[PDB]
Amino acid sequence: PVQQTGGGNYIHVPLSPRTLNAWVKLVEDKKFGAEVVPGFQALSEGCTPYDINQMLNCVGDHQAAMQIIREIINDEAADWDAQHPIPGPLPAGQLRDPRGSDIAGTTSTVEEQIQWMYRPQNPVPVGNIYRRWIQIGLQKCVRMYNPTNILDVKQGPKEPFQSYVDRFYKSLRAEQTDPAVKNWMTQTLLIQNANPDCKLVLKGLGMNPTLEEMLTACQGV
Amino acid sequence: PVQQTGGGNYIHVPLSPRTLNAWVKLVEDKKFGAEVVPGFQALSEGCTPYDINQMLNCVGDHQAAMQIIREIINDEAADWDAQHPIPGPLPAGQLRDPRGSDIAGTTSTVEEQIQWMYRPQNPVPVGNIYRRWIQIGLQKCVRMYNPTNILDVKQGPKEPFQSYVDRFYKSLRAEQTDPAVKNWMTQTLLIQNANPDCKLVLKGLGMNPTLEEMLTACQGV
Amino acid sequence: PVQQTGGGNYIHVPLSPRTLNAWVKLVEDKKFGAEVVPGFQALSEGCTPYDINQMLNCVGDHQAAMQIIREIINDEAADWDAQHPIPGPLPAGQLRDPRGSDIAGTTSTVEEQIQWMYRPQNPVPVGNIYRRWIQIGLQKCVRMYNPTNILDVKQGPKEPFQSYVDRFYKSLRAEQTDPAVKNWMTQTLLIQNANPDCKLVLKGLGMNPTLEEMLTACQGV
């Protein structure tokens, strides 16, 4: 994070321990759930890569997926050298041009990143690009760890349909499939993977039903 | 949210972690009680849409209801477009009168959301309008989740009358009936749906009894 | 069918008796299967609606699916009536411009159908339009009749993967699903709903195996 100073200049201001601690608890309590990506972004909002790295480095308990997150980040950096035509050399006394690794933080400091994040001639984000690389790694972890998949989400006679619907959408959310497939899944697979009593009730509800009407209708099973 | 610096300038700020955390707990622990609507407003009071979405996108349980809220928001934006003239050809370089998904903030950036909130030409307060759309979705869920209903709420023979009242009013609230219906229900259905022993006493109090008088007299029956 | 003779003089002929019979048998035996849609066309190519109406009528055993086809023809004709309305008072020496019902062949005579089909001003092949309207009705029936759905198709333990994929694919076509959904099911639902022994053998293939490679690999499994 950075604090502006009189004259239009900026200085580094450290990230809060509570924010770092809150990130670790979200990772452990939710076990790399799908909600570990968005909460992280808010906790890491207006931050540089240097501070973001600390949070990721603070945890050593789960390093199987933090290692996967690392692979994707350097992959984006490897791709970054071509995505951005190499700028070439500039005179001495001027800031260096940012590369893939500078975005990751394996090499650069918070001040160089602060100067890049607040450069009047060529302002460049180094932490929005990096957090995105981390988030792409975080999402792969969610899908790899997801316990039961959408096709296997099913309702038992005892299970109330509502409960089965929450599990189905949570899994559908963990996956990032095309919306069209989701529509076929949310209108067909949902009625299909139900207890047969309420499935017949959903046939009574009609064709092209809505979630409010499906939930209101099977209120009792 | 929004932070205004000297000179009339406006900037975006992160949303505090505890506010996100408190919103998450209220949604899950209260199982979408009727206080998850106001609990959302206070925590989101004076914030930008970009940070709201996050709060709603940091919760992984009761996800089916979150899908209902998403649909309601889309519909409000549809009506907004119908009631807001597409300005059409506009001076290029003029902040675009925000459209439907520019109030929700999905198709727009936080800065222009802040710029519309205080736009000198025609400020569009994106924040209050979007929170209201979400609130309507939250309110539908409270009703759908509500376990029982006012008509079926009935004092147990051995159950005390006051407990029946706590159950009755909580539902006269969860079911958001018009105030006139509320007066009629409170003046009558709290006596009709009661057990006979206390009902006679409530009739003995006199016509238009008041709740203080009804609770005091039926105390210990 | 129709038959030009001299001076471009088109005339009417009888529809072959073994063509009416073949349509009946294709329908009675394939039970309105998917191939009924094209088999109909090959047996009705160049036939006017009148003769097509005789073929469909000769089938008297199945009359619920034929009604579904009939309900659809009425609609298509009502969209050709609204969008192509009565021209008005046609000048002397003109024939009423073809309407949707004339395309159906219920009102217009075979001669009038031929006059429009070869009309120098309105050469509208009434036959191919009615044939197209019928296909849609036949296709709804195929989807409505198909015995086993894709989610309900699962390989038998004593059955091969190739036999199961054939039952699975036949169904995908009867369901007539969107192409994006088709790819997901074909690359996934064909493995999830497979004998566990061959499912693991479809994992050693790699990622996105092709059907050519999926079968050869599970050959004897």
Residue numbers in the entry:
A (entry chain D), B (entry chain B), C (entry chain C): 1 to 221
Share the article's original sentences:
During HIV-1 or HIV-2 infection, the capsid is a necessary component that protects the viral genome and recruits host factors while trafficking to the nucleus. The capsid is comprised of approximately ~1,600 copies of CA molecules, which oligomerize into ~250 hexamers and 12 pentamers (capsomeres) to form the distinct fullerene cone. In this study, we leveraged the approach of templating the HIV CA lattice assembly on liposomes, together with stabilization by the small-molecule host factor inositol hexakisphosphate (IP6),75–79 to produce regular HIV-2 CA lattices. We report the first high-resolution structures of HIV-2 CA capsomeres in their native mature lattice using single-particle cryo-EM.
Pentamer-containing particles were re-processed with C5 symmetry to reconstruct an HIV-2 CA pentamer map to 2.97 Å resolution. We observed density for IP6 in the central pores of both HIV-2 CA hexamers and pentamers, with clear density for R18 side chains. Specifically, we observed an exchange of polar contacts, as the hydrogen bonding potential of helix 2 residues Q41 and E45 is met by either Y50 and Q54 in the hexameric conformation or N57 and Q54 in the pentamer, allowing a change in register as helix 3 slides along helix 2. Upon shifting to the pentamer, D61 replaces Q63 to ionically interact with adjacent CTD residue R173, while K31 of the NTD contacts the adjacent D166. Furthermore, despite the lack of M66 gating in HIV-2, we did not observe density for either the CPSF6 or Nup153 peptide in the FG pocket of CA pentamers, indicating that another mechanism is responsible for the reduced binding to HIV-2.
